[PDB]
Short mmCIF file of N, CA and C and ligand atoms in Angstrom, two decimals:
data_model
loop_
_atom_site.label_atom_id
_atom_site.label_comp_id
_atom_site.label_asym_id
_atom_site.label_seq_id
_atom_site.Cartn_x
_atom_site.Cartn_y
_atom_site.Cartn_z
N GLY A 1 -83.68 3.13 39.32
CA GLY A 1 -83.13 2.88 38.00
C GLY A 1 -84.14 2.94 36.88
N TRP A 2 -85.03 3.93 36.91
CA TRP A 2 -86.04 4.11 35.88
C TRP A 2 -85.56 5.13 34.86
N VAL A 3 -85.72 4.81 33.58
CA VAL A 3 -85.33 5.68 32.48
C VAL A 3 -86.59 6.27 31.87
N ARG A 4 -86.65 7.60 31.83
CA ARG A 4 -87.82 8.27 31.28
C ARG A 4 -87.92 8.00 29.78
N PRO A 5 -89.08 7.59 29.28
CA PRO A 5 -89.21 7.36 27.83
C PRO A 5 -88.96 8.64 27.04
N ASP A 6 -88.31 8.49 25.90
CA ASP A 6 -87.99 9.62 25.05
C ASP A 6 -89.22 10.03 24.24
N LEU A 7 -89.04 11.05 23.40
CA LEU A 7 -90.13 11.50 22.54
C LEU A 7 -90.43 10.45 21.48
N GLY A 8 -91.72 10.21 21.24
CA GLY A 8 -92.13 9.27 20.23
C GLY A 8 -92.09 7.81 20.64
N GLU A 9 -92.00 7.52 21.93
CA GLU A 9 -91.91 6.15 22.40
C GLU A 9 -93.21 5.65 23.02
N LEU A 10 -93.86 6.47 23.85
CA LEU A 10 -95.12 6.05 24.45
C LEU A 10 -96.26 5.98 23.45
N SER A 11 -96.11 6.60 22.27
CA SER A 11 -97.14 6.57 21.24
C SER A 11 -96.94 5.45 20.24
N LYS A 12 -95.96 4.58 20.45
CA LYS A 12 -95.74 3.46 19.55
C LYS A 12 -96.89 2.47 19.65
N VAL A 13 -97.13 1.76 18.55
CA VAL A 13 -98.05 0.63 18.54
C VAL A 13 -97.24 -0.62 18.87
N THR A 14 -97.76 -1.44 19.78
CA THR A 14 -97.03 -2.58 20.31
C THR A 14 -97.83 -3.86 20.11
N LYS A 15 -97.20 -4.98 20.45
CA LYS A 15 -97.84 -6.29 20.40
C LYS A 15 -98.01 -6.82 21.81
N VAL A 16 -99.11 -7.53 22.04
CA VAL A 16 -99.42 -8.09 23.35
C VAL A 16 -99.56 -9.59 23.21
N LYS A 17 -98.83 -10.33 24.05
CA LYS A 17 -98.91 -11.78 24.09
C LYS A 17 -99.88 -12.16 25.21
N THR A 18 -101.07 -12.61 24.83
CA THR A 18 -102.11 -12.96 25.79
C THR A 18 -102.69 -14.32 25.45
N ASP A 19 -103.19 -15.00 26.48
CA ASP A 19 -103.81 -16.31 26.32
C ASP A 19 -105.32 -16.23 26.19
N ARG A 20 -105.90 -15.04 26.24
CA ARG A 20 -107.34 -14.89 26.07
C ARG A 20 -107.72 -15.23 24.63
N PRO A 21 -108.70 -16.11 24.42
CA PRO A 21 -109.05 -16.48 23.05
C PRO A 21 -109.61 -15.30 22.27
N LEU A 22 -109.31 -15.27 20.98
CA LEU A 22 -109.82 -14.22 20.12
C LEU A 22 -111.32 -14.40 19.93
N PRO A 23 -112.15 -13.41 20.26
CA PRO A 23 -113.59 -13.56 20.07
C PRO A 23 -113.93 -13.77 18.60
N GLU A 24 -114.77 -14.77 18.34
CA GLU A 24 -115.08 -15.18 16.98
C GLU A 24 -116.15 -14.31 16.33
N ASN A 25 -117.02 -13.70 17.13
CA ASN A 25 -118.13 -12.90 16.61
C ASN A 25 -118.48 -11.84 17.64
N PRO A 26 -117.68 -10.77 17.72
CA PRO A 26 -117.91 -9.76 18.77
C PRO A 26 -119.11 -8.87 18.50
N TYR A 27 -119.57 -8.79 17.25
CA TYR A 27 -120.70 -7.93 16.92
C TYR A 27 -122.05 -8.59 17.19
N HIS A 28 -122.06 -9.87 17.56
CA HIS A 28 -123.30 -10.61 17.79
C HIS A 28 -124.22 -10.55 16.57
N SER A 29 -123.62 -10.62 15.39
CA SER A 29 -124.36 -10.51 14.15
C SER A 29 -125.14 -11.80 13.87
N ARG A 30 -126.19 -11.65 13.08
CA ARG A 30 -126.99 -12.79 12.64
C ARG A 30 -126.32 -13.43 11.43
N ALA A 31 -127.05 -14.32 10.75
CA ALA A 31 -126.56 -14.95 9.53
C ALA A 31 -126.94 -14.09 8.33
N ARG A 32 -125.97 -13.84 7.46
CA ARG A 32 -126.23 -13.01 6.29
C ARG A 32 -127.20 -13.72 5.35
N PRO A 33 -128.20 -13.01 4.83
CA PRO A 33 -129.15 -13.64 3.92
C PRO A 33 -128.48 -14.10 2.63
N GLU A 34 -129.05 -15.14 2.04
CA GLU A 34 -128.45 -15.74 0.85
C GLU A 34 -128.48 -14.75 -0.31
N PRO A 35 -127.40 -14.68 -1.09
CA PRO A 35 -127.38 -13.75 -2.23
C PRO A 35 -128.26 -14.22 -3.38
N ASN A 36 -128.39 -13.38 -4.40
CA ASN A 36 -129.23 -13.69 -5.54
C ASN A 36 -128.58 -14.78 -6.40
N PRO A 37 -129.37 -15.49 -7.21
CA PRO A 37 -128.81 -16.61 -7.99
C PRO A 37 -127.69 -16.21 -8.93
N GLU A 38 -127.69 -14.97 -9.43
CA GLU A 38 -126.70 -14.46 -10.39
C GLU A 38 -126.35 -15.51 -11.44
N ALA A 39 -127.38 -15.91 -12.19
CA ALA A 39 -127.23 -16.95 -13.19
C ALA A 39 -126.29 -16.51 -14.31
N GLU A 40 -125.78 -17.50 -15.04
CA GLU A 40 -124.82 -17.26 -16.11
C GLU A 40 -125.15 -18.15 -17.29
N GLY A 41 -124.66 -17.76 -18.46
CA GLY A 41 -124.88 -18.53 -19.67
C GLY A 41 -124.38 -17.76 -20.87
N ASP A 42 -124.62 -18.34 -22.04
CA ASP A 42 -124.25 -17.72 -23.31
C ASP A 42 -125.48 -17.07 -23.93
N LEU A 43 -125.33 -15.82 -24.36
CA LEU A 43 -126.46 -15.09 -24.92
C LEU A 43 -126.87 -15.68 -26.26
N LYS A 44 -128.17 -15.73 -26.49
CA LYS A 44 -128.75 -16.18 -27.74
C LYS A 44 -129.70 -15.11 -28.27
N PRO A 45 -129.89 -15.03 -29.59
CA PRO A 45 -130.79 -14.02 -30.14
C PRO A 45 -132.20 -14.18 -29.59
N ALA A 46 -132.87 -13.05 -29.41
CA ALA A 46 -134.21 -13.06 -28.84
C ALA A 46 -135.15 -13.90 -29.69
N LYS A 47 -135.98 -14.69 -29.02
CA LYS A 47 -136.89 -15.59 -29.72
C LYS A 47 -137.94 -14.78 -30.47
N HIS A 48 -137.93 -14.89 -31.80
CA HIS A 48 -138.88 -14.19 -32.66
C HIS A 48 -138.80 -12.68 -32.48
N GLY A 49 -137.59 -12.17 -32.28
CA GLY A 49 -137.37 -10.74 -32.28
C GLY A 49 -137.96 -10.04 -31.07
N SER A 50 -138.45 -8.82 -31.30
CA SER A 50 -138.93 -7.98 -30.21
C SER A 50 -140.26 -8.48 -29.66
N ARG A 51 -141.09 -9.09 -30.50
CA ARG A 51 -142.44 -9.52 -30.11
C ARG A 51 -143.27 -8.37 -29.59
N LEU A 52 -143.05 -7.17 -30.13
CA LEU A 52 -143.80 -5.98 -29.74
C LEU A 52 -144.85 -5.71 -30.80
N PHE A 53 -146.09 -6.13 -30.51
CA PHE A 53 -147.24 -5.91 -31.39
C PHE A 53 -146.96 -6.55 -32.74
N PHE A 54 -146.98 -5.81 -33.84
CA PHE A 54 -146.87 -6.39 -35.17
C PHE A 54 -145.44 -6.42 -35.70
N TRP A 55 -144.46 -6.00 -34.90
CA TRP A 55 -143.09 -5.95 -35.38
C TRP A 55 -142.50 -7.35 -35.41
N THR A 56 -142.05 -7.78 -36.58
CA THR A 56 -141.48 -9.10 -36.77
C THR A 56 -139.96 -9.12 -36.64
N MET A 57 -139.35 -8.00 -36.28
CA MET A 57 -137.91 -7.93 -36.13
C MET A 57 -137.52 -7.10 -34.92
N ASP N 1 -149.78 -20.58 -57.78
CA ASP N 1 -149.10 -21.78 -57.31
C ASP N 1 -150.12 -22.78 -56.78
N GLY N 2 -149.62 -23.88 -56.23
CA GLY N 2 -150.47 -24.92 -55.70
C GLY N 2 -150.97 -24.62 -54.30
N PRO N 3 -152.01 -25.33 -53.87
CA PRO N 3 -152.52 -25.12 -52.51
C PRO N 3 -151.55 -25.50 -51.40
N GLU N 4 -150.59 -26.39 -51.66
CA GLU N 4 -149.68 -26.80 -50.59
C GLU N 4 -148.82 -25.63 -50.12
N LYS N 5 -148.46 -24.73 -51.03
CA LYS N 5 -147.67 -23.57 -50.65
C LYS N 5 -148.38 -22.74 -49.60
N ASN N 6 -149.64 -22.37 -49.87
CA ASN N 6 -150.40 -21.58 -48.91
C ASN N 6 -150.66 -22.37 -47.63
N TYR N 7 -150.95 -23.66 -47.77
CA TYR N 7 -151.19 -24.50 -46.60
C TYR N 7 -150.00 -24.47 -45.64
N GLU N 8 -148.81 -24.73 -46.15
CA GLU N 8 -147.64 -24.82 -45.28
C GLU N 8 -147.17 -23.45 -44.81
N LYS N 9 -147.33 -22.41 -45.64
CA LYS N 9 -147.04 -21.06 -45.17
C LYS N 9 -147.94 -20.68 -44.01
N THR N 10 -149.24 -21.00 -44.10
CA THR N 10 -150.14 -20.72 -43.00
C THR N 10 -149.76 -21.51 -41.76
N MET N 11 -149.35 -22.77 -41.94
CA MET N 11 -148.95 -23.56 -40.78
C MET N 11 -147.75 -22.94 -40.07
N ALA N 12 -146.74 -22.53 -40.85
CA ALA N 12 -145.57 -21.89 -40.25
C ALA N 12 -145.93 -20.59 -39.54
N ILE N 13 -146.78 -19.78 -40.18
CA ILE N 13 -147.19 -18.51 -39.57
C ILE N 13 -147.93 -18.76 -38.27
N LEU N 14 -148.82 -19.76 -38.26
CA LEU N 14 -149.57 -20.08 -37.05
C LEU N 14 -148.63 -20.52 -35.93
N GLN N 15 -147.63 -21.34 -36.26
CA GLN N 15 -146.67 -21.75 -35.24
C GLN N 15 -145.95 -20.54 -34.66
N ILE N 16 -145.51 -19.63 -35.53
CA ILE N 16 -144.77 -18.46 -35.06
C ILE N 16 -145.63 -17.61 -34.13
N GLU N 17 -146.87 -17.35 -34.52
CA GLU N 17 -147.73 -16.50 -33.69
C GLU N 17 -148.10 -17.18 -32.38
N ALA N 18 -148.36 -18.49 -32.40
CA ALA N 18 -148.66 -19.19 -31.15
C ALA N 18 -147.48 -19.14 -30.20
N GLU N 19 -146.27 -19.36 -30.72
CA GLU N 19 -145.09 -19.27 -29.87
C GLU N 19 -144.94 -17.86 -29.29
N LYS N 20 -145.18 -16.84 -30.11
CA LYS N 20 -145.06 -15.47 -29.62
C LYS N 20 -146.07 -15.19 -28.52
N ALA N 21 -147.31 -15.66 -28.68
CA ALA N 21 -148.32 -15.44 -27.65
C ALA N 21 -147.95 -16.11 -26.34
N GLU N 22 -147.49 -17.37 -26.41
CA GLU N 22 -147.07 -18.06 -25.19
C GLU N 22 -145.91 -17.33 -24.53
N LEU N 23 -144.96 -16.84 -25.33
CA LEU N 23 -143.83 -16.11 -24.77
C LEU N 23 -144.27 -14.82 -24.10
N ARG N 24 -145.25 -14.13 -24.69
CA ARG N 24 -145.74 -12.90 -24.07
C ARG N 24 -146.40 -13.18 -22.73
N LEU N 25 -147.22 -14.23 -22.65
CA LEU N 25 -147.83 -14.59 -21.37
C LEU N 25 -146.76 -14.93 -20.34
N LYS N 26 -145.76 -15.71 -20.74
CA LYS N 26 -144.69 -16.07 -19.82
C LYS N 26 -143.94 -14.84 -19.34
N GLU N 27 -143.69 -13.88 -20.24
CA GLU N 27 -143.00 -12.66 -19.86
C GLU N 27 -143.80 -11.87 -18.84
N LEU N 28 -145.11 -11.76 -19.04
CA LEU N 28 -145.92 -11.02 -18.09
C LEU N 28 -145.90 -11.68 -16.72
N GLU N 29 -146.04 -13.01 -16.68
CA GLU N 29 -146.01 -13.71 -15.40
C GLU N 29 -144.65 -13.57 -14.71
N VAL N 30 -143.57 -13.69 -15.48
CA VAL N 30 -142.23 -13.56 -14.91
C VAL N 30 -142.02 -12.17 -14.34
N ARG N 31 -142.45 -11.14 -15.07
CA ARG N 31 -142.31 -9.77 -14.58
C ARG N 31 -143.09 -9.58 -13.29
N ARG N 32 -144.32 -10.08 -13.24
CA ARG N 32 -145.13 -9.92 -12.03
C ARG N 32 -144.46 -10.58 -10.83
N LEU N 33 -144.00 -11.82 -11.01
CA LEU N 33 -143.35 -12.52 -9.90
C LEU N 33 -142.06 -11.82 -9.48
N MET N 34 -141.28 -11.36 -10.46
CA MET N 34 -139.99 -10.75 -10.16
C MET N 34 -140.17 -9.45 -9.40
N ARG N 35 -141.17 -8.65 -9.77
CA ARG N 35 -141.43 -7.42 -9.03
C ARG N 35 -142.00 -7.71 -7.65
N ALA N 36 -142.83 -8.75 -7.53
CA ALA N 36 -143.42 -9.05 -6.23
C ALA N 36 -142.37 -9.54 -5.24
N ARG N 37 -141.45 -10.39 -5.69
CA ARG N 37 -140.45 -10.99 -4.80
C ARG N 37 -139.13 -10.23 -4.81
N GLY N 38 -138.57 -9.96 -5.98
CA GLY N 38 -137.30 -9.28 -6.07
C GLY N 38 -136.08 -10.17 -6.05
N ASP N 39 -136.24 -11.46 -6.35
CA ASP N 39 -135.14 -12.41 -6.29
C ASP N 39 -134.51 -12.68 -7.65
N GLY N 40 -134.87 -11.91 -8.67
CA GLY N 40 -134.28 -12.06 -9.98
C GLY N 40 -133.46 -10.85 -10.38
N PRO N 41 -132.78 -10.93 -11.52
CA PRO N 41 -131.98 -9.79 -11.98
C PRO N 41 -132.79 -8.53 -12.22
N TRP N 42 -134.06 -8.65 -12.60
CA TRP N 42 -134.87 -7.47 -12.83
C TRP N 42 -135.35 -6.88 -11.50
N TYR N 43 -135.61 -5.58 -11.51
CA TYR N 43 -136.15 -4.86 -10.36
C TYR N 43 -135.23 -4.97 -9.14
N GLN N 44 -133.93 -4.83 -9.37
CA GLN N 44 -132.94 -4.85 -8.29
C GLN N 44 -132.57 -3.41 -7.97
N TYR N 45 -133.32 -2.81 -7.05
CA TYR N 45 -133.03 -1.44 -6.66
C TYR N 45 -131.73 -1.39 -5.86
N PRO N 46 -130.93 -0.34 -6.04
CA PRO N 46 -129.61 -0.31 -5.39
C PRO N 46 -129.72 -0.17 -3.88
N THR N 47 -128.73 -0.71 -3.19
CA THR N 47 -128.56 -0.59 -1.76
C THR N 47 -127.19 0.02 -1.46
N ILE N 48 -126.93 0.27 -0.19
CA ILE N 48 -125.66 0.87 0.20
C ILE N 48 -124.55 -0.14 0.02
N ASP N 49 -123.49 0.26 -0.68
CA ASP N 49 -122.33 -0.60 -0.84
C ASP N 49 -121.63 -0.79 0.50
N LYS N 50 -121.21 -2.03 0.77
CA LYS N 50 -120.54 -2.34 2.02
C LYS N 50 -119.03 -2.15 1.96
N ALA N 51 -118.48 -1.87 0.78
CA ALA N 51 -117.05 -1.59 0.67
C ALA N 51 -116.69 -0.22 1.22
N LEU N 52 -117.68 0.62 1.54
CA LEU N 52 -117.42 1.95 2.08
C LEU N 52 -117.16 1.95 3.58
N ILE N 53 -117.47 0.86 4.28
CA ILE N 53 -117.33 0.83 5.73
C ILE N 53 -115.85 0.82 6.10
N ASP N 54 -115.51 1.58 7.14
CA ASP N 54 -114.15 1.63 7.65
C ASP N 54 -114.01 0.64 8.80
N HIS N 55 -113.11 -0.32 8.65
CA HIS N 55 -112.85 -1.34 9.67
C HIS N 55 -111.49 -1.03 10.29
N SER N 56 -111.49 -0.20 11.32
CA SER N 56 -110.27 0.21 12.00
C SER N 56 -110.63 0.59 13.43
N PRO N 57 -109.67 0.58 14.35
CA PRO N 57 -109.93 1.09 15.69
C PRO N 57 -110.38 2.54 15.64
N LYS N 58 -111.40 2.86 16.43
CA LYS N 58 -112.13 4.11 16.29
C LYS N 58 -112.00 5.00 17.52
N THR N 59 -110.83 4.98 18.16
CA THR N 59 -110.54 5.82 19.32
C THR N 59 -111.50 5.57 20.48
N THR N 60 -112.39 4.59 20.32
CA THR N 60 -113.36 4.22 21.34
C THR N 60 -113.71 2.75 21.16
N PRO N 61 -113.56 1.93 22.19
CA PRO N 61 -113.73 0.48 22.01
C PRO N 61 -115.10 0.07 21.51
N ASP N 62 -116.16 0.75 21.93
CA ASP N 62 -117.52 0.32 21.63
C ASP N 62 -118.02 0.83 20.28
N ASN N 63 -117.11 1.20 19.38
CA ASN N 63 -117.47 1.72 18.06
C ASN N 63 -118.37 2.94 18.16
C1 LIG Y 101 -133.65 0.19 -51.35
C2 LIG Y 101 -132.15 -0.10 -51.48
C3 LIG Y 101 -131.68 -1.20 -50.54
C4 LIG Y 101 -132.39 -2.55 -50.78
O1 LIG Y 101 -132.74 -2.85 -51.87
O2 LIG Y 101 -132.62 -3.44 -49.69
C5 LIG Y 101 -133.65 -4.38 -49.91
C6 LIG Y 101 -134.22 -4.80 -48.54
C7 LIG Y 101 -133.97 -6.28 -48.32
O3 LIG Y 101 -134.31 -6.59 -46.98
P1 LIG Y 101 -134.82 -8.13 -46.62
O4 LIG Y 101 -134.47 -8.47 -45.20
O5 LIG Y 101 -134.14 -9.10 -47.54
O6 LIG Y 101 -136.46 -8.23 -46.82
C8 LIG Y 101 -137.21 -9.01 -45.90
C9 LIG Y 101 -138.71 -8.87 -46.23
O7 LIG Y 101 -138.88 -7.67 -46.93
C10 LIG Y 101 -139.61 -8.80 -44.94
O8 LIG Y 101 -138.76 -8.73 -43.81
P2 LIG Y 101 -139.47 -8.56 -42.30
O9 LIG Y 101 -140.94 -8.89 -42.39
O10 LIG Y 101 -138.80 -9.51 -41.33
O11 LIG Y 101 -139.28 -6.98 -41.76
C11 LIG Y 101 -140.38 -6.10 -41.87
C12 LIG Y 101 -140.70 -5.50 -40.49
C13 LIG Y 101 -139.47 -4.82 -39.92
O12 LIG Y 101 -139.09 -3.76 -40.79
C14 LIG Y 101 -139.20 -2.47 -40.21
O13 LIG Y 101 -139.28 -2.37 -39.03
C15 LIG Y 101 -139.20 -1.20 -41.09
C16 LIG Y 101 -140.61 -0.65 -41.34
C17 LIG Y 101 -140.79 -0.10 -42.77
C18 LIG Y 101 -139.58 -0.35 -43.68
C19 LIG Y 101 -139.47 0.72 -44.80
C20 LIG Y 101 -138.28 0.46 -45.76
C21 LIG Y 101 -138.23 1.49 -46.93
C22 LIG Y 101 -139.04 2.76 -46.64
C23 LIG Y 101 -139.43 3.52 -47.92
C24 LIG Y 101 -140.41 4.69 -47.64
C25 LIG Y 101 -141.79 4.20 -47.19
C26 LIG Y 101 -142.84 5.35 -47.17
O14 LIG Y 101 -141.73 -4.55 -40.64
C27 LIG Y 101 -142.83 -4.78 -39.77
O15 LIG Y 101 -142.69 -5.43 -38.80
C28 LIG Y 101 -144.22 -4.18 -40.10
C29 LIG Y 101 -144.23 -2.64 -40.03
C30 LIG Y 101 -145.15 -2.04 -41.10
C31 LIG Y 101 -145.20 -0.49 -41.06
C32 LIG Y 101 -144.81 0.08 -39.68
C33 LIG Y 101 -146.04 0.64 -38.92
C34 LIG Y 101 -146.31 2.12 -39.25
C35 LIG Y 101 -147.52 2.29 -40.19
C36 LIG Y 101 -147.48 3.63 -40.97
C37 LIG Y 101 -146.16 3.82 -41.74
C38 LIG Y 101 -145.94 5.29 -42.17
C39 LIG Y 101 -144.58 5.85 -41.70
C40 LIG Y 101 -144.62 7.37 -41.49
C41 LIG Y 101 -145.22 8.12 -42.69
O16 LIG Y 101 -135.60 -4.56 -48.52
C42 LIG Y 101 -135.94 -3.18 -48.47
O17 LIG Y 101 -135.26 -2.43 -47.85
C43 LIG Y 101 -137.20 -2.66 -49.23
C44 LIG Y 101 -138.27 -2.15 -48.27
C45 LIG Y 101 -138.53 -3.12 -47.13
C46 LIG Y 101 -139.99 -3.60 -47.09
C47 LIG Y 101 -140.19 -4.81 -46.13
C48 LIG Y 101 -141.19 -4.48 -44.99
C49 LIG Y 101 -142.63 -4.96 -45.31
C50 LIG Y 101 -143.69 -4.34 -44.37
C51 LIG Y 101 -143.95 -2.83 -44.67
C52 LIG Y 101 -143.93 -2.52 -46.19
C53 LIG Y 101 -143.92 -1.00 -46.47
C54 LIG Y 101 -143.35 -0.67 -47.88
C55 LIG Y 101 -143.27 0.85 -48.13
C56 LIG Y 101 -142.78 1.19 -49.56
C57 LIG Y 101 -141.29 0.92 -49.78
C58 LIG Y 101 -140.78 1.52 -51.11
C59 LIG Y 101 -139.36 1.09 -51.47
#
């Protein structure tokens, strides 16, 4: 009493009910290095202008 | 005019130039440290973006 699968049936994506725990870190990766401080604030005019040689502005 | 005008103008000018000199020294030191370490916003050379990686089954379990 076996029914041959039709076209487009064996290529379906299916779901599997298993009791095996999901691996938490399969890549065996290390700890990611800390990112840069990426500081924030409100911009203020440059102190005493450009300060390039004799230029006062 | 009186001597007080020149006196106080010179005092203000001296303050401005001293502040500028201290700021220039601080800028040079900050630049040196930032280039040596690379932990500040300056001298951040680009790296490969990680949003380009494809996270999908790859027809082979071991990637
Ligand atoms: C005019 C109609 C509009 C109007 O009335 O606006 C008024 C307007 C009002 O502005 P203000 O903010 O109230 O004035 C603030 C104080 O003046 C002072 O303000 P400050 O001190 O904060 O800003 C001055 C500062 C920042 O200013 C600048 O960066 C500009 C530099 C020169 C300004 C030139 C303005 C007019 C040019 C006329 C042609 C000159 C030749 O300049 C410097 O840091 C020093 C630079 C000195 C020369 C640059 C080094 C090169 C040497 C060889 C030069 C030869 C060039 C190639 C040849 O003033 C003007 O536009 C008049 C001229 C500005 C002179 C002040 C700069 C002093 C130091 C250089 C003096 C050279 C004078 C040359 C003769 C000028 C003949 C007119």
